User: Which sequence fits this backbone?
RNA sequence: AUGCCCCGAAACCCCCGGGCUACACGCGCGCUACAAUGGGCGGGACAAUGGGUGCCGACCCCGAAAGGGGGAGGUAAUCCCCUAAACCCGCCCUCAGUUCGGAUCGCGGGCUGCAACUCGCCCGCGUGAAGCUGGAAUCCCUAGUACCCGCGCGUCAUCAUCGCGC
RNA sequence: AGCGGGGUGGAGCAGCCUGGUAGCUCGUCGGGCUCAUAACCCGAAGAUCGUCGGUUCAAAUCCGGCCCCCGCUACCA
């Protein structure tokens, strides 16, 4: 009842080159990794590695909704912009291979009211 | 000789149909995959299902257990590259149902967008919802 | 284009992320169907308009497919897009929610792009919803016209159930 | 207090007597017609019969006990 991703434990995923890991992800993630990371993602990754090393005792806030979750990011809490505020996300092992934006909804759930004037033919 | 009901892999099969179409009653087997397994087993896909003998049924079930090891291509199975083991699997009946349920449950545990959409019973693959997808009752003004 | 009134360190000018794609519900215009005046599998036939150098790409090789690697010729009555579909012949299915219908969803593989989650398009296996011809009402059309069938251009990095034409 | 009568969609009435589909008119919601409203047309929702029991192959219908409503009469601190 441990975690496995394609028959690998978490540690085996930790000690992998970015290329070796890219062969396990779905096609969209593989193409995104092969084409390189954008500069903003580079800065975010630098901050993440610093925080893991034992420095940067501050919360991580980022505008990068298109960043792919990587195994070395597991255990940290990231604040992802949803359009008007930063929401906390706690990265769990079963999130590997997803974009960050999937965990920060940008619209509010709809609870309908009573239909107003002009909602039907007879109300006009 | 002729049997009007033949039991294969826990599903009764109509004995009057051609074997390729009789096989589709199994959940997880469509018309294309059925023809593939008929060809691999070396049986005429146009024969009546009622003329199957016991050894032939045993062989068909053996093939359905692990198609890849019997020569069926990896790009033909309904769950390639399994999320847990990493292998190429083909699931039928209950196993298929519980695998799909587990996939949706995993999506729901991490509070992903698609998991929320599954919970609320709303379209998941990006459809517009202002006009179509209406299932309910007209409200009064 | 332009008078008057307003803002004139914000109502002007840039950058990042969201939205215009929300969803108990009412309506317009369409597409796909409810099967035999058919569905599937193999085989055989015959176009026109337009467009191409930030582009059209034959021909060879690799891959099951979507696609990938090289690349002649073309600034074009010369080279390319470009060997249409409805139609015809043979076999399977025989009136059934089905070998009718293909919505919805799972897993995997690709392309464009600085970026594909919100929110793109394509391919393989699986899954298999409503629908069995439609009340009161109401639209279009007089001849190569209406019905039926595909194709080109515009938009366009990618994307056509649309517009204008054939 | 005594006697007589009756309870059925939101409203007012059939369906009893002769047991075996719960109908009629208005009303609400939606679509039609008209430049728009009313009138008119179409479709759908809505009571399982005041409750409880007995009878019967089967009860709104036959019977009985309760709850409520209406009418008539006796009734002088
Ligand atoms: Mg809009
Ligand atoms: Mg079909
Ligand atoms: Mg998406
Ligand atoms: Mg029918
Ligand atoms: Mg348009
Ligand atoms: Mg009116």
Assistant:
């Amino acid at each position: 009842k441990e975690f496995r991703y394609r028959g690998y434990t978490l540690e085996q995923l930790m000690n992998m080159s970015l290329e070796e890991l890219a062969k396990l992800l779905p096609a969209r993630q593989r193409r995104s990794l092969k084409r390189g990371l954008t500069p903003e993602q580079k800065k975010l990754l630098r901050k993440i590695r610093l925080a893991k090393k034992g420095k940067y005792n501050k919360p991580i806030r980022t505008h990068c909704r298109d960043m792919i979750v990587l195994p070395e990011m597991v255990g940290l809490t990231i604040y992802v912009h949803n359009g008007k505020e930063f929401v906390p996300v706690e990265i769990k092992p079963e999130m590997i291979g997803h974009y960050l934006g999937e965990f920060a909804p940008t619209r509010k759930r709809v609870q309908h009211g009573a239909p107003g004037i002009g909602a039907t033919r007879s109300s006009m | 000789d002729f049997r009007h009901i033949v039991r294969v892999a826990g599903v009764d099969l109509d004995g009057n149909k051609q074997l390729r179409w009789a096989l589709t009653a199994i959940k997880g087997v469509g018309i294309n995959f059925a023809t593939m397994v008929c060809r691999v087993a070396g049986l005429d896909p146009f024969m009546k299902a009622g003329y199957l003998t016991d050894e032939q049924v045993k062989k068909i079930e053996e093939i359905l257990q692990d198609p890849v090891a019997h020569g069926i291509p990896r790009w033909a199975v309904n769950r390639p590259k399994d999320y847990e083991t990493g292998r190429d699997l083909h699931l039928i009946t209950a196993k298929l149902d519980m695998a799909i349920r587990e996939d949706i449950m995993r999506l729901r545990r991490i509070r992903a967008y698609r998991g929320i959409r599954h919970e609320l019973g709303l379209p998941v693959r990006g459809q517009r919802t202002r006009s179509n997808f209406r299932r309910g009752q007209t409200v009064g003004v």
About this structure: Chain A has four helices and three strands. The longest strand of chain A covers residues 77-81.
